[PDB]
Amino acid sequence: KEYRLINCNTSACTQACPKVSFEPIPIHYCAPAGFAILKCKDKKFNGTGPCPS
Amino acid sequence: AENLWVTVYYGVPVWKDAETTLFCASDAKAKHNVWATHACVPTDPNPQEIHLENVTEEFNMWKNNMVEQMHTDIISLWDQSLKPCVKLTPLCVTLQCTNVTNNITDDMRGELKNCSFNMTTELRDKKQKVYSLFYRLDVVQINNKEYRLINCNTSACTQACPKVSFEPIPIHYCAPAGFAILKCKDKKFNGTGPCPSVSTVQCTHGIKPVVSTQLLLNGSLAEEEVMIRSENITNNAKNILVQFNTPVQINCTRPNNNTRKSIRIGPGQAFYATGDIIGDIRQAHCNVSKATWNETLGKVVKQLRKHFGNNTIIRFANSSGGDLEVTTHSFNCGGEFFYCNTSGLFNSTWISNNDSITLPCRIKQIINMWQRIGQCMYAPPIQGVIRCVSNITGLILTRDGGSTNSTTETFRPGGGDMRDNWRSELYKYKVVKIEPLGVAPTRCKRRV
Amino acid sequence: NITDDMRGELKNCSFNMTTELRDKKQKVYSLFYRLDVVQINN
Amino acid sequence: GIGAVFLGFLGAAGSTMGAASMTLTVQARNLLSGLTVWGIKQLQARVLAVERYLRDQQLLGIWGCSGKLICCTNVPWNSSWSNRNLSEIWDNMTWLQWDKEISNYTQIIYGLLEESQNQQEKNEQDLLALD
Amino acid sequence: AVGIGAVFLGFLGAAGSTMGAASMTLTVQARNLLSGLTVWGIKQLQARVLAVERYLRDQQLLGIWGCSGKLICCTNVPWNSSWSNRNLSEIWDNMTWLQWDKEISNYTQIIYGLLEESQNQQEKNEQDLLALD
Amino acid sequence: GIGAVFLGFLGAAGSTMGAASMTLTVQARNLLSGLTVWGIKQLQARVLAVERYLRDQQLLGIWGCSGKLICCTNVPWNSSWSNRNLSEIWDNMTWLQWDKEISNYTQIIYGLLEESQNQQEKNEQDLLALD
Ligand SMILES: *[C@@H]1O[C@H](CO)[C@@H](O[C@@H]2O[C@H](CO)[C@@H](O[C@@H]3O[C@H](CO)[C@@H](O)[C@H](O[C@H]4O[C@H](CO)[C@@H](O)[C@H](O)[C@@H]4O[C@H]4O[C@H](CO)[C@@H](O)[C@H](O)[C@@H]4O)[C@@H]3O)[C@H](O)[C@H]2NC(C)=O)[C@H](O)[C@H]1NC(C)=O
Ligand SMILES: *[C@@H]1O[C@H](CO)[C@@H](O[C@@H]2O[C@H](CO)[C@@H](O)[C@H](O)[C@H]2NC(C)=O)[C@H](O)[C@H]1NC(C)=O
Ligand SMILES: *[C@@H]1O[C@H](CO)[C@@H](O[C@@H]2O[C@H](CO)[C@@H](O)[C@H](O)[C@H]2NC(C)=O)[C@H](O)[C@H]1NC(C)=O
Ligand SMILES: *[C@@H]1O[C@H](CO)[C@@H](O[C@@H]2O[C@H](CO)[C@@H](O)[C@H](O)[C@H]2NC(C)=O)[C@H](O)[C@H]1NC(C)=O
Ligand SMILES: *[C@@H]1O[C@H](CO)[C@@H](O[C@@H]2O[C@H](CO)[C@@H](O)[C@H](O)[C@H]2NC(C)=O)[C@H](O)[C@H]1NC(C)=O
Ligand SMILES: *[C@@H]1O[C@H](CO)[C@@H](O[C@@H]2O[C@H](CO)[C@@H](O)[C@H](O)[C@H]2NC(C)=O)[C@H](O)[C@H]1NC(C)=O
Ligand SMILES: *[C@@H]1O[C@H](CO)[C@@H](O[C@@H]2O[C@H](CO)[C@@H](O)[C@H](O)[C@H]2NC(C)=O)[C@H](O)[C@H]1NC(C)=O
Ligand SMILES: *[C@@H]1O[C@H](CO)[C@@H](O[C@@H]2O[C@H](CO)[C@@H](O)[C@H](O)[C@H]2NC(C)=O)[C@H](O)[C@H]1NC(C)=O
Ligand SMILES: *[C@@H]1O[C@H](CO)[C@@H](O[C@@H]2O[C@H](CO)[C@@H](O)[C@H](O)[C@H]2NC(C)=O)[C@H](O)[C@H]1NC(C)=O
Ligand SMILES: *[C@@H]1O[C@H](CO)[C@@H](O[C@@H]2O[C@H](CO)[C@@H](O)[C@H](O)[C@H]2NC(C)=O)[C@H](O)[C@H]1NC(C)=O
Ligand SMILES: *[C@@H]1O[C@H](CO)[C@@H](O[C@@H]2O[C@H](CO)[C@@H](O)[C@H](O)[C@H]2NC(C)=O)[C@H](O)[C@H]1NC(C)=O
Ligand SMILES: *[C@@H]1O[C@H](CO)[C@@H](O[C@@H]2O[C@H](CO)[C@@H](O)[C@H](O)[C@H]2NC(C)=O)[C@H](O)[C@H]1NC(C)=O
Ligand SMILES: *[C@@H]1O[C@H](CO)[C@@H](O[C@@H]2O[C@H](CO)[C@@H](O)[C@H](O)[C@H]2NC(C)=O)[C@H](O)[C@H]1NC(C)=O
Ligand SMILES: *[C@@H]1O[C@H](CO)[C@@H](O[C@@H]2O[C@H](CO)[C@@H](O)[C@H](O)[C@H]2NC(C)=O)[C@H](O)[C@H]1NC(C)=O
Ligand SMILES: *[C@@H]1O[C@H](CO)[C@@H](O[C@@H]2O[C@H](CO)[C@@H](O)[C@H](O)[C@H]2NC(C)=O)[C@H](O)[C@H]1NC(C)=O
Ligand SMILES: *[C@@H]1O[C@H](CO)[C@@H](O[C@@H]2O[C@H](CO)[C@@H](O)[C@H](O)[C@H]2NC(C)=O)[C@H](O)[C@H]1NC(C)=O
Ligand SMILES: *[C@@H]1O[C@H](CO)[C@@H](O)[C@H](O)[C@H]1NC(C)=O
Ligand SMILES: *[C@@H]1O[C@H](CO)[C@@H](O)[C@H](O)[C@H]1NC(C)=O
Ligand SMILES: *[C@@H]1O[C@H](CO)[C@@H](O)[C@H](O)[C@H]1NC(C)=O
Ligand SMILES: *[C@@H]1O[C@H](CO)[C@@H](O)[C@H](O)[C@H]1NC(C)=O
Ligand SMILES: *[C@@H]1O[C@H](CO)[C@@H](O)[C@H](O)[C@H]1NC(C)=O
Ligand SMILES: *[C@@H]1O[C@H](CO)[C@@H](O)[C@H](O)[C@H]1NC(C)=O
Ligand SMILES: *[C@@H]1O[C@H](CO)[C@@H](O)[C@H](O)[C@H]1NC(C)=O
C-alpha cells in the first residue's frame, strides 16, 4: 500500500500558517477623492438596466 | 520711463538638461514577454511631435542617460521574468557523457554530447536515470567519461520559462509631464555637437531591445549615408558605431530537427531536455549575400576614409580574442542563442583607388547575459527546425593602434558592452526639464 | 598549545558536507567555539 | 492678428521673448499630463510631475502672482542683473537665451519678490484697518 | 450658494436638478474633491496619487483661464451658436448638467483653447495698460 | 523687517506675532521641498507633503483667501475665543503661544470662515445677476 500526496505531480503545497485566521472580515471598498460610488437603492433591481432610485 | 520692473511669466518655453525616470509605452496591437509589455502604458496611435523652429540644441550620444537607464531597465526586466521560472539546482550532478555519432557531419563532430545522469523525481525518495543531449560548450570534463555543467562551480542556472518569449518588442520611452524629449532631426548628425534641426516628442520611437555583440540587427537605418559615430575617432580605445543606410539581410538557421523532453525533476517542476535529433546532424550557420556585404563594406570604407585620410588603406580583420561572447556575433534566434564566427565577414583590404557567405555558428544553452557572473540562465531546447531572417543595421568596430608611420588602418569587430546596442537607437534623443517660470524686465508696474 | 583558560572553548569538528555536485559529498573539518555547538543526546 | 501657423508645446522656444509670450498657455497646459518594473517608474513619474507643478505654483503664490500668466510686480529691475535694453530683450532674445543670463541672479530676484509680496500684504492689511 | 431654505445639501445632491438650481450648490461638490509592503497599502497610495492628480487637473485649467479661486467665473469668450443653439431658458431651466455635458462634449476642447487664448490676451493687455503709468 | 539679521525657516518662531508676520514667505517656501520598501516609503512621504500643502491651499480657497499670505475676513472676533487686547496679542506673545490658546476654538473659526465665504459668494452672485 504505497501512496503519495495528490499534489506531488502538480506543485508543492505551502502549509497555511496556523496562527493566520481564515475568518472572512467585512471589507468596505472605498473610492478615491474625485471618484464616487453610486448605489442602486431600487428594491426590485435585477442587476441590469436603469435604476430609478 | 527708464525704470524697469520685474515681471513674472508662467509657461515660458525654457528647459534644462535633466535625468528622470522614463517609463515605457507599447503598441496596443502587440503570450507573455521578457520585456513585460502588459505593464507598459499603451502608446498614442498618432504620436505628437512639435517642430522647434530656430532651436539649436547640443546633444551628446555618449553621455546620454537614456542609455544607462535603458540598460538598467532591460536587466531588471530580465531578472523579473526569470524570477518565477524553475531553478536548475538538481541538474548539478555528475554526467556520464558519450559522443553523438549518429549521422553527424565532420564539422559537427564532438560538438554534441549524449549524457545520462540520475535526477530527482517528484518524490524526494526516488531517482530517475534520464539522459539528455548537451552541447560541448555546456559540459566540462570532471578531472564513458564523467562531465558536469559549465555553471556548476559558479551558480545554479535558472531555466527560462518556455511560455515566455524572448522576441524583442518595440519599447517607447516616454517622459513624465513637465519633462520633454528632444529629437535631433538632422540627417547628418554624428552623435555629438549642436543639432540645428530639433523637435520635441513625449515618447521615443519603437526601440527593439535587440541583444547582439558584433552586428546591430533589426535596428534603425541611416537616412542618407553610412554614419560612423565614435566618442573620439582619434582614440583607438573607443568603439566605432557604424549605421547602415541600407540593411544587409542575414539568414540564420539551426538545421537540426531537435526534440524536447520534459523531465519532471520535482513537484510542479520540469526540466526540458533535448531528446534525439530526427535526421542528420549539421552545423548551424548564417548567410549574408556576398555582393550586398561587399557593397556595404565599400560604403563603410568610403565614409571611414573621411576621418582616416583619403589614401590610407582600410582593412577589416576578425576579432582579436577573448571569450566566445566577444569574439563571435552572438544573438538569440527565437529562443536559441547563436554564436557565429564572423571571420568571413571582416576579412579584406581596401586600396585608395550570386554567392553567399556562410558563417559557422555554435549554439549554447547556459547563457551568462549582461556579462554578469554567478547568474546564468538555461535556454530550453526549441523543438523542430529554427530559421530567422534579420537585417544587419550596423556594426561595432574597433581600431588597432598602429604606430611607426602606419599608412594602413585595421578595423575589427568588437561587442562587449550592451549599452552600445541601445546607444545606436537613443542617439538622437535627450531628456530636458521644463522651467515654466521666468522673470524679465518690463515697463509694467503692479497697481496698489 | 592552549592555556588553562581556553580548555574546551574550541572544538575540532568533522562532518560530511555537500559538494558542488548533488551526488558527491566531502568530508571536511572545522574549528567551532564551544558556544556554537550543542551535544547531540569522539 | 491671431494667425499663428501652429501652436505646440515649446513651439515658440526659438521665437523672441515678445513673440513667445503670446503662447504661455501652450506650455502651461502640458505641465501636468503631456509592483512590476514598469509599474513603479510610472508612479514615480506621476508623483514627480505633481511635485514640480506644485513647486512652480507655490512660487507663483508666495509672489502674489497666483493664477496669472503674466504678473507684474513692485520689484524694480537692478541693472546689475542685466544691463541690456528693453528693445534688445523682447525683440532680439529667446527665453532660452535669457534664462542662461539671469541664472546667477534668479534666487536674489525670488527673494526680493517674496519680500515685496509680504510687504504688500502687510500694507494692504494696514490700509484696510483704517476703513 | 449658502442654501437658504434648502432641504439638504450633499455631494452630487443636485445631480438631477436643473442647471440653474444645481448652480447654487457648487460649494458642496468643490470641497469634497480632495478629502472625500501589503496589497492594501499599494492600493491606498495609488488612490491618493489619483485623487491629487484629478484635483490638480481641474485646478490647472481654472488657473490658466483666469478663474483661479472662483466657483462661477465669467469670461470674455463669446458663445458660438454652433456649439449649442438652445435658448438660455432652455438650458438653465429644462436641462441638467449631466445632459449638458453630453451636448457640448464635442466642443469642449475648442472652448478650452478659446478660454486660454482669451486669458493670455487679457494678461498681455493688462500688462500694456499698466506699462503706461 | 526692512533690514533683518537673518531670515530662516522658523527663525521667527520666538518673535512676537507682529514681527513674525513679516517672515511668512520664509516658512511658506519650505513646505514643499526637502522594487523595495524604501522607495515606497519615500513615495508615501512625498505624497503626504503634497496632500498637506493642497489641503492648506484648499482651506485658504474655500475661505476666499486664495493665494494670499495675509487675508482679511468678514468674520467678527468672538471675545469668548480670547479676551486679550490687540496690543497684547501682536506685541506680547508669539504664534506658538497664540496657537496653544485658541487651539480649542480653531475648528469653530474655520467653519465660521467657510460659511461667511459662502454668504459672500451668494451676495456676489445675486448682485451679478441683478445687473
Ligand atoms: C529581427 O526581426 C525578424 C522579424 O521581425 C525576426 O524574425 C522573426 O523571428 C520570430 C521568432 O524567432 C518568428 O516568430 C516565430 O515564427 C515561427 C515560424 O513561423 C513560429 O513557429 C513561432 O511560433 C512559436 O514560437 C512562439 C514564440 O513565442 C510561440 O509563442 C508560438 O506559440 C509558437 O510556439 C508554439 O508552437 C510551436 C509550433 O507549433 C510549438 O513547437 C511550441 O511548443 C509552441 O506550442 C514564432 O511565431 C518570426 O516568424 C520571424 N519573422 C521573420 C520575418 O523571419 C528576427 O528573429 C529578428 N532578429 C533578432 C536578432 O531578434
Ligand atoms: C497528477 O496525477 C493525477 C493522479 O495520478 C492525475 O489525474 C489522473 O490523470 C489520468 C490521466 O490519464 C486520468 O486518467 C485520471 O482519471 C486522473 N485521476 C484523477 C483523480 O485526477 C493528473 O492528471 C496528474 N497531473 C499531471 C499534470 O500529470
Ligand atoms: C543517447 O544515448 C541513449 C542511451 O543512453 C540512447 O537511447 C537508447 O538507444 C538504444 C539504441 O538505440 C535503445 O536500445 C535504448 O532503448 C535507448 N534508451 C535508453 C534509455 O537506453 C539514445 O539513442 C542516444 N542518442 C543519440 C543521439 O546518440
Ligand atoms: C569523443 O569525444 C571526446 C571528447 O570530446 C573527443 O576525444 C578527442 O578526440 C580528438 C580526436 O582524436 C582528440 O583531440 C583526442 O583524441 C580526444 N581528446 C580531447 C578532445 O580532449 C572526441 O570528440 C571523441 N573521441 C572518441 C575516441 O570517441
Ligand atoms: C546513477 O545511479 C546508479 C545507481 O543508483 C549508479 O550505478 C552505481 O554505480 C556505482 C559506481 O561504483 C556502483 O558501485 C553501483 O553498484 C551502481 N549501482 C547500480 C548500477 O544500481 C550510477 O553510477 C549513477 N550515475 C549515472 C547513472 O550516471
Ligand atoms: C569553474 O571551472 C572552470 C573550468 O574548470 C574554470 O575555468 C578555468 O579556470 C582556471 C583557473 O585556474 C583557468 O586556468 C582555466 O583556463 C579556466 N578554463 C576555462 C575553460 O574557463 C573556472 O575558473 C572555475 N570558476 C571558479 C569560480 O572556480
Ligand atoms: C581623443 O584621443 C586623443 C588620443 O588619445 C587625445 O589626444 C591625446 O591627448 C593626451 C592628453 O594630453 C596626450 O597625452 C596624447 O599625446 C594625445 N594623443 C594624440 C594622438 O593626440 C585627444 O585629447 C582626445 N580628444 C578628447 C576631446 O579628449
Ligand atoms: C546558406 O547557404 C548555404 C550555401 O548556399 C545553403 O546550403 C545549401 O542548401 C541547398 C538546399 O537549400 C543545398 O542544395 C546545397 O547543397 C547547400 N550547400 C552547401 C554548401 O551545403 C544553406 O541552405 C543556406 N542556409 C540559409 C539559412 O540561408
Ligand atoms: C521534425 O521531426 C518531426 C517528428 O518526426 C516531424 O513531425 C512529423 O512530421 C510528419 C511528416 O508527415 C508528420 O506525419 C507527423 O505527424 C509529425 N509529427 C510527429 C511525427 O510527431 C517534423 O515534420 C520534422 N521537421 C522537419 C523534418 O523539418
Ligand atoms: C535569405 O532568405 C530569403 C528567404 O527567406 C531569401 O530570399 C529568397 O531568395 C530566393 C533565391 O533568390 C528567391 O527565389 C526567393 O523568392 C526569395 N524570397 C524572399 C521572400 O525574398 C534571400 O535570398 C536569402 N539571402 C541570403 C543572403 O541567403
Ligand atoms: C581570426 O582569423 C584568423 C585567421 O583567419 C584565425 O586563425 C588563427 O589566428 C590566430 C591569431 O589570433 C593564430 O594564433 C592561430 O594559429 C590561427 N589559427 C587557428 C586555427 O586559430 C583566428 O582563429 C580567428 N579568430 C577568431 C576569434 O575568429
Ligand atoms: C572562424 O573561421 C575561420 C575560417 O572560416 C577559422 O580559421 C580556420 O581555422 C581552422 C581550424 O579551426 C584552420 O584549420 C584554418 O586554417 C583556419 N583558416 C583561416 C583562413 O584562418 C577560425 O578558426 C574560426 N574561428 C574560431 C574557430 O574561433
Ligand atoms: C580571408 O581572405 C583571404 C583572401 O581571399 C582568403 O585566402 C584565400 O582563400 C581562398 C578560399 O579557399 C583560397 O583558395 C586561397 O588560396 C586563399 N589565399 C591565401 C590564403 O593567400 C582566406 O581564406 C580568408 N579567410 C577566411 C575567410 O577565414
Ligand atoms: C529588413 O529589411 C527589409 C528589406 O529592406 C524590410 O522589408 C521591407 O519592409 C517594409 C515594411 O515592412 C516594406 O514596405 C518593404 O517593401 C520591405 N522591403 C522589401 C524589399 O520587401 C524589413 O522591414 C526590414 N526589417 C526586418 C525586421 O526584416
Ligand atoms: C574535552 O572536552 C570536553 C567537553 O568540554 C571536556 O570534558 C568534560 O566535559 C564535562 C561537560 O562539560 C565537564 O564537566 C568536565 O569538566 C570536562 N572535563 C573532564 C575531565 O571531564 C574537556 O574539555 C575535555 N575532556 C577530555 C579531553 O577528557
Ligand atoms: C560521513 O559519511 C561517512 C560515510 O558515509 C561515515 O562513515 C561511515 O560511518 C558508518 C557508521 O556511521 C560506518 O558503518 C561506515 O563504515 C563508515 N564509512 C566510512 C567510509 O567511514 C561518517 O560517519 C560520516 N560522518 C563523518 C563525520 O565523517
Ligand atoms: C562630430 O561633429 C562635430 C561637429 O559637429 C565635431 O566637432 C566632432 O569632432 C565630430 N565627431 C566625430 C567625427 O567623431
Ligand atoms: C569586394 O571589393 C573589393 C574591392 O574591389 C575586392 O577586393 C573584393 O574581392 C570584393 N569581394 C568579393 C569579390 O567577394
Ligand atoms: C578626399 O577625396 C574626395 C574624393 O571624392 C574629395 O571629394 C575630397 O575633397 C578629398 N578630401 C581632401 C583631399 O581633403
Ligand atoms: C555665473 O556664475 C558662474 C559661477 O560663479 C560663472 O562661471 C559665470 O561666468 C557667471 N555668469 C553670469 C552671467 O553671471
Ligand atoms: C459628437 O460627435 C460624434 C462624432 O463625430 C457624433 O457621432 C455625435 O453625433 C456628435 N454629437 C453632437 C451632440 O454633436
Ligand atoms: C461667542 O461664543 C459663545 C460660545 O462659546 C456664544 O455663547 C456667544 O454667543 C458668542 N458670541 C458672539 C458675539 O459670537
Ligand atoms: C481647551 O480645552 C481643554 C479641555 O478639552 C481645557 O483643559 C483647556 O483649558 C482649554 N483651553 C483653553 C480654554 O484655552
PDB file of C-alpha atoms in Angstrom, chain B residues 35-159:
ATOM      1  CA  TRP B  35      10.194  42.869 -21.556  1.00  0.00           C
ATOM      2  CA  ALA B  36       6.861  42.956 -19.760  1.00  0.00           C
ATOM      3  CA  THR B  37       4.551  44.787 -22.158  1.00  0.00           C
ATOM      4  CA  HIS B  38       1.182  44.247 -20.478  1.00  0.00           C
ATOM      5  CA  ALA B  39       2.578  46.563 -17.782  1.00  0.00           C
ATOM      6  CA  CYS B  40       3.505  49.288 -20.297  1.00  0.00           C
ATOM      7  CA  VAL B  41       1.138  52.180 -20.964  1.00  0.00           C
ATOM      8  CA  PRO B  42      -0.444  51.941 -24.442  1.00  0.00           C
ATOM      9  CA  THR B  43       1.195  54.231 -26.971  1.00  0.00           C
ATOM     10  CA  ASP B  44      -0.594  57.077 -28.689  1.00  0.00           C
ATOM     11  CA  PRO B  45      -1.620  55.714 -32.120  1.00  0.00           C
ATOM     12  CA  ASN B  46      -0.933  59.182 -33.595  1.00  0.00           C
ATOM     13  CA  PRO B  47       2.212  60.460 -31.862  1.00  0.00           C
ATOM     14  CA  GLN B  48       2.542  64.219 -31.445  1.00  0.00           C
ATOM     15  CA  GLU B  49       5.809  65.865 -32.498  1.00  0.00           C
ATOM     16  CA  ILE B  50       6.348  69.634 -32.396  1.00  0.00           C
ATOM     17  CA  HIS B  51       8.942  71.189 -34.696  1.00  0.00           C
ATOM     18  CA  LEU B  52      11.086  73.590 -32.652  1.00  0.00           C
ATOM     19  CA  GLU B  53      11.880  76.239 -35.245  1.00  0.00           C
ATOM     20  CA  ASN B  54      15.107  78.232 -34.740  1.00  0.00           C
ATOM     21  CA  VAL B  55      16.169  75.919 -31.885  1.00  0.00           C
ATOM     22  CA  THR B  56      19.738  74.602 -31.904  1.00  0.00           C
ATOM     23  CA  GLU B  57      20.400  72.038 -29.175  1.00  0.00           C
ATOM     24  CA  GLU B  58      23.584  70.307 -28.038  1.00  0.00           C
ATOM     25  CA  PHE B  59      23.318  66.509 -27.997  1.00  0.00           C
ATOM     26  CA  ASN B  60      25.845  64.018 -26.624  1.00  0.00           C
ATOM     27  CA  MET B  61      25.231  60.488 -27.887  1.00  0.00           C
ATOM     28  CA  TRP B  62      27.856  59.106 -25.485  1.00  0.00           C
ATOM     29  CA  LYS B  63      26.914  60.867 -22.224  1.00  0.00           C
ATOM     30  CA  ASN B  64      23.198  60.230 -22.771  1.00  0.00           C
ATOM     31  CA  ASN B  65      21.434  58.997 -19.635  1.00  0.00           C
ATOM     32  CA  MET B  66      18.572  57.423 -21.601  1.00  0.00           C
ATOM     33  CA  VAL B  67      21.020  54.615 -22.449  1.00  0.00           C
ATOM     34  CA  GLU B  68      22.151  53.674 -18.940  1.00  0.00           C
ATOM     35  CA  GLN B  69      18.538  53.835 -17.777  1.00  0.00           C
ATOM     36  CA  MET B  70      17.506  51.535 -20.625  1.00  0.00           C
ATOM     37  CA  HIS B  71      20.307  49.117 -19.731  1.00  0.00           C
ATOM     38  CA  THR B  72      19.184  49.016 -16.102  1.00  0.00           C
ATOM     39  CA  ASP B  73      15.536  48.559 -17.085  1.00  0.00           C
ATOM     40  CA  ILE B  74      16.381  45.741 -19.502  1.00  0.00           C
ATOM     41  CA  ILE B  75      18.422  43.914 -16.865  1.00  0.00           C
ATOM     42  CA  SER B  76      15.668  44.387 -14.281  1.00  0.00           C
ATOM     43  CA  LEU B  77      13.033  43.044 -16.676  1.00  0.00           C
ATOM     44  CA  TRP B  78      15.236  40.043 -17.455  1.00  0.00           C
ATOM     45  CA  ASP B  79      15.606  39.271 -13.749  1.00  0.00           C
ATOM     46  CA  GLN B  80      11.886  39.763 -13.113  1.00  0.00           C
ATOM     47  CA  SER B  81      10.960  37.402 -15.944  1.00  0.00           C
ATOM     48  CA  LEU B  82      13.420  34.787 -14.688  1.00  0.00           C
ATOM     49  CA  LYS B  83      12.302  35.035 -11.047  1.00  0.00           C
ATOM     50  CA  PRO B  84       9.269  32.680 -11.273  1.00  0.00           C
ATOM     51  CA  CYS B  85      10.951  30.113 -13.534  1.00  0.00           C
ATOM     52  CA  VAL B  86      12.429  26.772 -12.497  1.00  0.00           C
ATOM     53  CA  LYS B  87      15.777  26.795 -10.688  1.00  0.00           C
ATOM     54  CA  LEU B  88      18.009  24.007 -12.017  1.00  0.00           C
ATOM     55  CA  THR B  89      19.801  23.204  -8.776  1.00  0.00           C
ATOM     56  CA  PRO B  90      19.378  19.401  -9.090  1.00  0.00           C
ATOM     57  CA  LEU B  91      20.939  19.494 -12.566  1.00  0.00           C
ATOM     58  CA  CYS B  92      24.388  19.962 -10.990  1.00  0.00           C
ATOM     59  CA  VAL B  93      25.161  16.246 -10.880  1.00  0.00           C
ATOM     60  CA  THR B  94      27.809  14.008 -12.399  1.00  0.00           C
ATOM     61  CA  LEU B  95      27.036  13.217 -16.044  1.00  0.00           C
ATOM     62  CA  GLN B  96      28.208  10.115 -17.921  1.00  0.00           C
ATOM     63  CA  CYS B  97      28.546  11.631 -21.384  1.00  0.00           C
ATOM     64  CA  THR B  98      29.316   9.870 -24.660  1.00  0.00           C
ATOM     65  CA  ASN B  99      29.775  11.323 -28.127  1.00  0.00           C
ATOM     66  CA  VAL B 100      26.873  11.680 -30.539  1.00  0.00           C
ATOM     67  CA  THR B 101      27.960   9.999 -33.781  1.00  0.00           C
ATOM     68  CA  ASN B 102      24.619   9.180 -35.445  1.00  0.00           C
ATOM     69  CA  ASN B 103      24.570  10.915 -38.843  1.00  0.00           C
ATOM     70  CA  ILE B 104      26.954  13.754 -37.941  1.00  0.00           C
ATOM     71  CA  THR B 105      28.887  15.816 -40.449  1.00  0.00           C
ATOM     72  CA  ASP B 106      32.613  16.259 -39.922  1.00  0.00           C
ATOM     73  CA  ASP B 107      32.182  19.869 -38.793  1.00  0.00           C
ATOM     74  CA  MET B 108      29.696  18.865 -36.068  1.00  0.00           C
ATOM     75  CA  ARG B 109      31.947  16.147 -34.651  1.00  0.00           C
ATOM     76  CA  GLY B 110      32.214  16.258 -30.874  1.00  0.00           C
ATOM     77  CA  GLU B 111      30.010  19.359 -30.691  1.00  0.00           C
ATOM     78  CA  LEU B 112      27.144  17.339 -29.164  1.00  0.00           C
ATOM     79  CA  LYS B 113      27.357  15.072 -26.117  1.00  0.00           C
ATOM     80  CA  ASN B 114      24.941  12.319 -25.087  1.00  0.00           C
ATOM     81  CA  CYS B 115      24.786  12.500 -21.290  1.00  0.00           C
ATOM     82  CA  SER B 116      22.993  10.248 -18.804  1.00  0.00           C
ATOM     83  CA  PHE B 117      22.542  11.070 -15.130  1.00  0.00           C
ATOM     84  CA  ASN B 118      20.457  10.373 -12.045  1.00  0.00           C
ATOM     85  CA  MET B 119      17.849  13.079 -11.500  1.00  0.00           C
ATOM     86  CA  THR B 120      15.448  13.747  -8.655  1.00  0.00           C
ATOM     87  CA  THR B 121      11.889  12.505  -9.122  1.00  0.00           C
ATOM     88  CA  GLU B 122       8.680  14.173  -7.980  1.00  0.00           C
ATOM     89  CA  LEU B 123       9.122  12.045  -4.854  1.00  0.00           C
ATOM     90  CA  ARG B 124      12.022  13.004  -2.599  1.00  0.00           C
ATOM     91  CA  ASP B 125      12.952   9.328  -2.060  1.00  0.00           C
ATOM     92  CA  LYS B 126      13.068   8.194  -5.712  1.00  0.00           C
ATOM     93  CA  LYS B 127      15.529   8.926  -8.514  1.00  0.00           C
ATOM     94  CA  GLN B 128      15.259   8.547 -12.283  1.00  0.00           C
ATOM     95  CA  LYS B 129      18.079   7.672 -14.677  1.00  0.00           C
ATOM     96  CA  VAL B 130      17.482  10.090 -17.545  1.00  0.00           C
ATOM     97  CA  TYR B 131      19.621  11.287 -20.440  1.00  0.00           C
ATOM     98  CA  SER B 132      19.939  14.497 -22.423  1.00  0.00           C
ATOM     99  CA  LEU B 133      21.932  15.955 -25.302  1.00  0.00           C
ATOM    100  CA  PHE B 134      24.312  18.730 -24.236  1.00  0.00           C
ATOM    101  CA  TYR B 135      26.480  20.911 -26.441  1.00  0.00           C
ATOM    102  CA  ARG B 136      30.206  20.630 -25.803  1.00  0.00           C
ATOM    103  CA  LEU B 137      30.248  24.298 -24.782  1.00  0.00           C
ATOM    104  CA  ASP B 138      27.997  23.467 -21.806  1.00  0.00           C
ATOM    105  CA  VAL B 139      29.806  20.465 -20.266  1.00  0.00           C
ATOM    106  CA  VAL B 140      33.212  20.273 -18.574  1.00  0.00           C
ATOM    107  CA  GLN B 141      35.080  17.024 -18.013  1.00  0.00           C
ATOM    108  CA  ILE B 142      35.490  16.159 -14.327  1.00  0.00           C
ATOM    109  CA  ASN B 143      39.263  15.847 -13.908  1.00  0.00           C
ATOM    110  CA  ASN B 144      32.373   6.756 -20.933  1.00  0.00           C
ATOM    111  CA  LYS B 145      33.749   9.829 -19.157  1.00  0.00           C
ATOM    112  CA  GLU B 146      32.389  11.991 -16.353  1.00  0.00           C
ATOM    113  CA  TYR B 147      31.278  15.550 -17.129  1.00  0.00           C
ATOM    114  CA  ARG B 148      29.498  18.411 -15.392  1.00  0.00           C
ATOM    115  CA  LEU B 149      27.635  21.519 -16.462  1.00  0.00           C
ATOM    116  CA  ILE B 150      29.819  24.573 -17.002  1.00  0.00           C
ATOM    117  CA  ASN B 151      27.961  26.647 -14.400  1.00  0.00           C
ATOM    118  CA  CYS B 152      28.171  24.130 -11.554  1.00  0.00           C
ATOM    119  CA  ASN B 153      31.162  25.869  -9.930  1.00  0.00           C
ATOM    120  CA  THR B 154      29.756  29.396 -10.357  1.00  0.00           C
ATOM    121  CA  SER B 155      25.979  29.273  -9.788  1.00  0.00           C
ATOM    122  CA  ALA B 156      22.796  27.302 -10.430  1.00  0.00           C
ATOM    123  CA  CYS B 157      21.196  28.123 -13.769  1.00  0.00           C
ATOM    124  CA  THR B 158      17.567  29.247 -13.867  1.00  0.00           C
ATOM    125  CA  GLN B 159      15.670  27.609 -16.713  1.00  0.00           C
TER     126      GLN B 159
END
